[PDB]
Design an enzyme around this catalytic site. Structure first.
Site, PDB file in Angstrom:
ATOM      1  N   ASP C  72       0.837  -1.192   0.000  1.00 44.43           N
ATOM      2  CA  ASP C  72       0.000   0.000   0.000  1.00 44.43           C
ATOM      3  C   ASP C  72       0.874   1.246   0.000  1.00 44.43           C
ATOM      4  OD1 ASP C  72      -2.837   0.495  -0.089  1.00 44.43           O
ATOM      5  OD2 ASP C  72      -2.640   1.497   1.853  1.00 44.43           O
ATOM      6  N   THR C 105      -3.699   4.716  -3.910  1.00 43.29           N
ATOM      7  CA  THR C 105      -2.755   5.540  -3.166  1.00 43.29           C
ATOM      8  C   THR C 105      -1.354   5.520  -3.759  1.00 43.29           C
ATOM      9  OG1 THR C 105      -1.900   3.901  -1.609  1.00 43.29           O
ATOM     10  CG2 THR C 105      -4.095   4.788  -1.197  1.00 43.29           C
ATOM     11  N   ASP C 403      -8.654  -2.331   1.660  1.00 43.32           N
ATOM     12  CA  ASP C 403      -8.724  -1.767   0.315  1.00 43.32           C
ATOM     13  C   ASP C 403      -9.925  -2.316  -0.445  1.00 43.32           C
ATOM     14  OD1 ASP C 403      -6.507  -0.230   0.756  1.00 43.32           O
ATOM     15  OD2 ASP C 403      -5.331  -1.049  -0.907  1.00 43.32           O
TER      16      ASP C 403
HETATM   17  N1  LIG Z   1      -5.128  -8.066 -13.958  1.00 44.15           N
HETATM   18  C1  LIG Z   1      -4.634  -6.842 -14.259  1.00 44.15           C
HETATM   19  N2  LIG Z   1      -4.217  -6.545 -15.507  1.00 44.15           N
HETATM   20  C2  LIG Z   1      -3.723  -5.335 -15.818  1.00 44.15           C
HETATM   21  N3  LIG Z   1      -3.601  -4.330 -14.935  1.00 44.15           N
HETATM   22  C3  LIG Z   1      -3.982  -4.488 -13.647  1.00 44.15           C
HETATM   23  C4  LIG Z   1      -4.532  -5.783 -13.228  1.00 44.15           C
HETATM   24  N4  LIG Z   1      -4.822  -5.671 -11.921  1.00 44.15           N
HETATM   25  C5  LIG Z   1      -4.487  -4.413 -11.535  1.00 44.15           C
HETATM   26  N5  LIG Z   1      -3.982  -3.710 -12.564  1.00 44.15           N
HETATM   27  C6  LIG Z   1      -3.517  -2.302 -12.524  1.00 44.15           C
HETATM   28  O1  LIG Z   1      -2.534  -2.088 -11.511  1.00 44.15           O
HETATM   29  C7  LIG Z   1      -2.638  -0.739 -11.049  1.00 44.15           C
HETATM   30  C8  LIG Z   1      -2.208  -0.618  -9.592  1.00 44.15           C
HETATM   31  O2  LIG Z   1      -3.193  -1.176  -8.729  1.00 44.15           O
HETATM   32  P1  LIG Z   1      -2.837  -1.494  -7.192  1.00 44.15           P
HETATM   33  O3  LIG Z   1      -1.340  -1.669  -7.084  1.00 44.15           O
HETATM   34  O4  LIG Z   1      -3.739  -2.619  -6.749  1.00 44.15           O
HETATM   35  O5  LIG Z   1      -3.287  -0.192  -6.357  1.00 44.15           O
HETATM   36  P2  LIG Z   1      -2.718   1.285  -6.638  1.00 44.15           P
HETATM   37  O6  LIG Z   1      -3.590   1.810  -7.750  1.00 44.15           O
HETATM   38  O7  LIG Z   1      -2.889   1.981  -5.312  1.00 44.15           O
HETATM   39  O8  LIG Z   1      -1.281   1.056  -7.026  1.00 44.15           O
HETATM   40  C9  LIG Z   1      -4.081  -0.320 -11.268  1.00 44.15           C
HETATM   41  O9  LIG Z   1      -4.121   0.953 -11.916  1.00 44.15           O
HETATM   42  C10 LIG Z   1      -4.668  -1.375 -12.182  1.00 44.15           C
HETATM   43  O10 LIG Z   1      -5.177  -0.763 -13.368  1.00 44.15           O
END
Ligand SMILES: Nc1ncnc2c1ncn2[C@@H]1O[C@H](COP(=O)(O)OP(=O)(O)O)[C@@H](O)[C@H]1O
Ligand SMILES: Nc1ncnc2c1ncn2[C@@H]1O[C@H](COP(=O)(O)OP(=O)(O)O)[C@@H](O)[C@H]1O
Ligand SMILES: [Mg+2]
Ligand SMILES: [Mg+2]
Lengths: 116, 52, 535, 526
Positions: C72, C105, C403
């Protein structure tokens, strides 16, 4: 005077209980101890709170059954004679609480028992 | 066959030797006080207490 | 350029203007902006490696040596010991995004860093930072409008939770609980839906209790439609399991009554002593009989009680637990459908809560016991009980489930979603690019820089997944331009397709709008600052 | 750029930051150091350690337990902290496997370091390890054998499990005696998981083979002055009352009179109240009385005149254990004698154990509480015997809860690694290499077991691998001479729960540590 002097380590605080029958002591190993003035036996030793305790407060309205202890664990945790258990604990303090005042109780942050 | 396990680590042997040396030193220290012809020892604490 | 001013007058006399001016520093003009941009770039580049499903973790150590492995971004920046004021602004931006949304975040910091990085080369060409901020605001408005345009709606019915499950899975995909991904999403969705004011109103997180105990496995994490307490039956010999329990909640310690005012009871004769002793015994017996008369099978107190009351409770087949905390008392009262009674005389049958099963749970070779209340009628409170192999993954699972709950809460507030994986950012960048072509050329540079900064999320996703960033982003952008499909993003998991609709990568529109808005405002402030006066 | 390697400084004084190279290096070094330290205390031929405290007490302790070794060390490496917490949680969940899980995690992280050196993205390693863990867990579950139906077979399995647990500890000298001891102690619990019901008393002097399980119960308290010291066909009454200047709980009450005659009358009334309390207690028709709290002189002499043996200050655990062993009910009011059941035993007497006198309960009624007396040459020996008995009792209790057993001596590790290798052989990409490294660590576990014995580890591991690939699913290391043999015949069995927990926790912690690419430290208080 009692002058019991049964203690392996030093005494951070030796708080005479409000009831005029027993004393409450906490050694330097972070374990509180209850002694009977008349008989002299150690009623029960309270485990937990690994760092040394620094303040002892009995209940103000007599009630020689609950007390609060705080030390270097950055903890404010409350005991009970009738069960020998930590009935309540607090986490707000972050630095070696020196003295605690019982109101709820104010330690140095005013805690409330009715709402944690 | 021939050679066996190499035993690369040498610390266990050193620990065993040191333990034995300490035990032998203690035994030799207290050997003089054995039997009817043994003799007492005077031990002075840090606080100043003296015991024979 | 630093330390302030040092003149000592043109007549030789002392010239003291500000207290301790000899030991105070000062930055003036463009160099202050460059230093701020460089610090923000450092923070953003640190953050960007933890972005996406393939993002890696940061292992945080506090001043006491406690270790917190986490992904996070808000937690990382909150636990990061920075001294630079712009870094503190980044930390506050992450905390703001966490408070408002709960997810994204880490994206906000990367977006702000990219915006300031582009603003650096815009400033180098002789553009007033206020104009850059205005262009960024215009481009952010365009991007927000485009996001509203390309948004899609989902059904938030309890009968069909599949879109909610997919959204929670997308939220959890970047966390360590992706092994239990579907179960975690299911329990988060069910926890939010069980406790929520249905008329699109708020979701009270005070009624979602998240508790974690070491041991077991992550797969042992479960949603309990009741309350889990860290207490046990007071007497060691009472039964450990009560079924169809009629629960009596009390906040009066099972002790003889005590006035609050300073009171002295005078004993002046032997008869007075006997009367007082009989009064004590009859008070104990009467309070126990009053508890029993309501038909209750289980009694819960808050302030504990003494030996006589304990043995009377055991003798009358009344299992009881003492020293239950106030919030736990409230949760039990809410879940069991019973009221809180302040004294025994007011305890009636209609104030009794009901639970289908009250049990005491052991945790292996640990001597620790926990009470479980569940199988209620229409329980409005839930408890998430997390198990794991160490405390660190337990804390990480706690924040990951938080989250997920926040994301489902956002879906409750607004049911419009945007497909993630960089598709939203790419479409917004394209919209800003077309809008900039019609703008007068002077703000065109600011708008194009905003589009380039927006394009950093797909590049970060591609680079974290091992793909070539520029080539993948260019190919996806060309595909989006050729065929009108704002759902094409980065294939982070290598599923074989670039379309996030089939991949079910779903993000809340509110989250993206908040990300863009907060990043734009923070960048505007950082650009507006031109002096630093640290001591 | 980087947070630390930038022209402007973004940290407070003392704050640090380690990027991918430094973070991975420090994590791997810490994990490998912890694994190497805790290993060599593994297997039947493992050795013990000396833990010297640097504090004022300078506490000395020798132990073979991995969890206790990892607990009592000053650790600064955060990954080492992760592994220490893993070992502690493993100890909390089950009694054994503390060393095995730490060694497995360390070997997994070493293989991860090798894979990273081979230019493999850690996410691919994590995915391959997840697949390998799933396959290994499935294989181990399929290999489990349950004997909970037959009582004789279950008792034999319990004996084998206790022997295997004790084989690596200092109790291996009298393994047979201590195995009988632990099995009897656990079976006396009558199915309950309450390990606190088994009390271990450590008395110095005597041999380690002089340790025994008392057929009844032993209490380390004292009897009153005038009370009898020997009761036959006792009628136990366990209480948790005051019996010590017992005051009315109306704390606002006070005695306010105008003459000392009234004060004397009130004092006589208090004494009469105590006498009436004692008479109510005696009306139960009892021979013995155990009170959790203190008993003052006046109730003491009342009990002595009544000819009733009164034991005072038996703590919460003491009264609970007496209730479990005699069947009595811990009472606090005595107005209803017919509603309180009384414990019973054939005889109570005082016995001498070394130079101390203890109260002995013989011919107990229920006996669902045990007292194990440990005699040893040194305090360290007593502490290690207590720890070994704790491990054995915990594993036996877990096996009583879940009767599924798996074969030890590296058999389970070989089977899981063979399944992982089979899975990897049918998988394309670098995930196959990751699963092969997983299986390599699984092989390394019994490799370390054999190395600790000074055997030819490579040849034994190769023979085990060949036997398991052929189809001999019960082959394992035979530490008696240093060959391979049938673990079912040789009776090396383990709790399926223990190995499942070890494998899952090791994989989980390895994945958790491997996910880290940056370590950021706050400025320490010191
Ligand atoms: N299965 C997936 N395929 C492609 N992109 C993904 C997938 N899962 C999450 N993402 C992308 O990863 C990015 C980061 O998400 P995450 O790390 O969970 O929280 P944060 O947005 O706070 O970094 C998001 O903008 C999302 O679009
Ligand atoms: N008699 C035996 N023959 C072969 N292997 C054994 C025997 N006893 C124990 N082992 C092995 O020794 C390993 C280590 O166990 P031990 O050192 O007692 O504690 P831990 O299980 O916590 O590592 C176990 O995995 C077990 O397979
Ligand atoms: Mg997210
Ligand atoms: Mg073991």
């Amino acid at each position: 005077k009692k002058s019991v002097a049964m203690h392996t380590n030093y005494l951070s605080a030796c708080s005479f209980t409000n009831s005029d029958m027993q004393i409450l002591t906490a050694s330097g190993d972070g374990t509180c101890a209850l002694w009977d003035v008349e008989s002299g036996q150690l009623l029960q030793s309270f485990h937990g709170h690994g760092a040394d305790v620094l303040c002892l407060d009995l209940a103000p309205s007599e009630t020689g059954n609950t007390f609060v202890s705080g030390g270097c664990d950055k903890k404010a945790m409350v005991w009970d004679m009738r069960s020998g258990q930590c009935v309540q604990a607090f986490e707000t303090h972050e630095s070696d609480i020196n003295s605690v005042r019982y109101y709820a109780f104010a330690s140095g942050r005013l805690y409330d028992l009715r709402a944690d | 066959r021939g050679k066996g396990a190499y035993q690369d680590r040498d610390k266990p042997a050193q620990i065993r030797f040191s333990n034995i040396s300490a035990a032998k030193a203690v035994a030799d220290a207290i050997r003089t006080s054995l039997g009817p012809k043994g003799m007492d020892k005077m031990i002075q604490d840090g606080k100043g207490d003296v015991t024979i | 350029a630093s330390m302030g001013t040092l003149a000592f007058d043109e007549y030789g006399r002392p010239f003291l203007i500000i207290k301790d001016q000899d030991r105070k520093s000062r930055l003036m003009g463009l160099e202050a902006l460059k230093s701020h941009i460089m610090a923000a770039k450092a923070v953003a580049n640190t953050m960007r490696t933890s972005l996406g499903p393939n993002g890696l973790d940061k292992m945080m150590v506090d001043k006491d040596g406690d270790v917190t492995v986490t992904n996070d971004g808000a937690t990382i920046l909150s636990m990061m010991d920075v001294d630079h004021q712009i870094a503190k602004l980044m930390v506050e931006l992450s905390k703001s995004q966490d408070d408002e949304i709960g997810d994204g975040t880490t994206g906000v910091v990367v977006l702000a860093g990219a915006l300031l990085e582009e603003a650096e080369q815009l400033l180098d060409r002789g553009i007033h930072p206020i104009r850059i901020a205005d262009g960024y605001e215009q481009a952010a408005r365009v991007a927000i409008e485009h996001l509203d345009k390309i948004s899609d709606s989902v059904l938030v019915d309890i009968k069909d939770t599949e879109p909610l499950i997919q959204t929670a899975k997308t939220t959890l995909g970047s966390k360590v609980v992706n092994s239990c991904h579907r179960q975690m999403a299911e329990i988060a969705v069910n926890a939010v839906l069980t406790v929520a004011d249905m008329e699109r109103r708020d979701v009270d997180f005070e009624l979602i209790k998240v508790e974690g105990k070491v041991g077991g496995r992550l797969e042992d994490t479960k949603l309990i439609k009741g309350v889990i307490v860290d207490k046990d039956f007071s007497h060691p010999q009472m039964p450990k399991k009560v079924e169809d329990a009629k629960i009596a909640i009390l906040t009066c310690p099972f002790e003889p009554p005590k006035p609050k005012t300073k009171h002295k009871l005078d004993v002046t004769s032997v008869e007075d002593y006997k009367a007082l002793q009989k009064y004590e015994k009859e008070k104990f017996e009467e309070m126990i009989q009053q508890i029993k008369e309501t038909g209750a099978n289980l009694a819960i107190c808050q302030w504990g009680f003494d030996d006589e009351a304990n043995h009377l409770l055991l003798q009358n087949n009344l299992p009881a637990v003492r020293w239950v905390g106030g919030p736990e008392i409230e949760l039990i009262a809410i879940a069991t459908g019973g009221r809180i009674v302040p004294r025994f005389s007011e305890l009636t049958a209609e104030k009794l809560g009901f639970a289908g099963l009250v049990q005491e749970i052991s945790f292996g070779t640990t001597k620790d016991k926990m009470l479980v209340i569940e199988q209620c009628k229409n329980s409005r409170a839930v408890t998430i009980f997390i198990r794991g192999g160490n405390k660190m993954i337990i804390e990480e699972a706690k924040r990951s489930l938080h989250d997920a709950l926040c994301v489902i809460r956002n879906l409750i507030r607004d049911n419009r979603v945007v497909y993630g994986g960089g598709a939203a950012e790419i479409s917004c960048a394209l919209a800003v690019s077309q809008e900039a072509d019609k703008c007068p050329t002077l703000e065109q540079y600011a708008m194009r820089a905003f589009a380039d900064a927006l394009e950093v999320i797909p590049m970060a996703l591609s680079e974290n997944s091992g793909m070539n960033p520029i080539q993948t982003m260019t190919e996806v952008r060309a595909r989006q331009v050729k065929e009108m499909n704002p759902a094409l993003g980065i294939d982070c998991l290598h599923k074989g397709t670039n379309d996030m609709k089939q991949q079910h990568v779903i993000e809340t529109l509110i989250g993206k709008k908040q990300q863009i808005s907060l990043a734009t405002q923070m960048v505007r402030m950082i650009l507006k600052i031109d002096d630093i006066r640290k001591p | 750029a980087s947070l630390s390697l930038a022209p402007v400084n973004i940290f407070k004084a003392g704050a640090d930051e380690e990027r991918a190279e430094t973070a991975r290096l420090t994590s791997f070094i810490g994990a490998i150091a912890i694994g190497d330290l805790v290993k060599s205390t593994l297997g039947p031929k493992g050795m013990d350690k000396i833990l010297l405290s640097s504090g004022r007490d300078a506490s000395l302790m020798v132990t073979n337990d991995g969890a206790t070794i990892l607990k009592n060390i000053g650790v600064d490496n955060p990954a080492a902290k992760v592994l220490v917490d893993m070992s502690r949680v493993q100890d909390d969940e089950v009694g054994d496997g503390t060393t095995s899980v730490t060694v497995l995690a360390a070997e997994l992280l070493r293989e991860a370091e090798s894979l990273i050196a081979k230019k493999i993205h850690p996410q691919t390693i994590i995915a391959g390890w997840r697949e390998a863990t799933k396959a290994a867990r499935e294989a181990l579950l399929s290999s489990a054998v349950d004997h909970g139906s037959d009582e004789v077979k279950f008792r034999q399995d319990l004996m084998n499990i206790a022997g295997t647990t004790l084989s690596s500890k200092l109790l291996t000298h009298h393994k047979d005696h201590f195995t009988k001891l632990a099995v009897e102690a656990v079976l006396r619990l009558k199915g309950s998981g309450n390990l606190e019901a088994i009390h271990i008393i450590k008395k110095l002097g005597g041999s380690l083979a002089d340790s025994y399980l008392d057929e009844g119960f032993l209490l380390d308290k004292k009897i009153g002055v005038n009370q009898p010291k020997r009761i036959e066909n006792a009628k136990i009454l366990i209480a948790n009352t005051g019996m010590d200047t017992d005051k009315i709980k109306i704390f606002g009450s006070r005695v306010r009179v105008d003459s000392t005659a009234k004060v004397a009358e009130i004092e006589h009334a208090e004494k009469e109240k105590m006498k009436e309390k004692v008479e109510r207690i005696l009306k139960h028709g009892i021979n013995c009385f155990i009170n959790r709290q203190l008993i003052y002189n006046y109730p003491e002499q009342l009990f002595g005149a009544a000819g009733v043996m009164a034991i005072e200050h038996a703590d919460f655990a003491g009264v609970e254990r007496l209730a479990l062993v005699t069947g009595g009910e811990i009472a606090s009011t005595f107005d209803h004698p017919e509603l309180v059941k009384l414990g019973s035993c054939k005889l109570i007497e005082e016995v001498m154990i070394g130079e101390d006198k203890l109260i002995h309960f013989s011919g107990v009624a229920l006996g669902e509480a045990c007292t194990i007396v440990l005699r040893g040459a040194t305090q360290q020996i007593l502490d290690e015997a207590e720890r070994s008995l704790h491990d054995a009792l915990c594993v036996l209790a877990q096996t009583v809860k879940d009767s599924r057993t798996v074969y030890g001596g590296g058999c389970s590790e070989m089977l899981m690694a063979h399944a992982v290798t089979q899975l990897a052989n049918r998988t394309p990409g670098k995930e196959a290499v990751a699963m092969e490294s997983y299986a390599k660590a699984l092989r390394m576990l019994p490799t370390i077991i054999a190395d600790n014995a000074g055997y030819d580890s490579a040849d034994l591991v190769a023979q085990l691998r060949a036997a398991h690939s052929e189809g001999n699913t019960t082959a394992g290391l035979d530490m008696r001479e240093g060959t391979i043999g049938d673990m079912a015949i040789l009776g090396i069995t383990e709790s399926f729960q223990v190995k499942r927990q070890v494998l899952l926790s090791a994989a989980e912690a390895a994945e958790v540590i491997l996910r880290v690419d940056n370590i950021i430290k706050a400025a320490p208080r010191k």
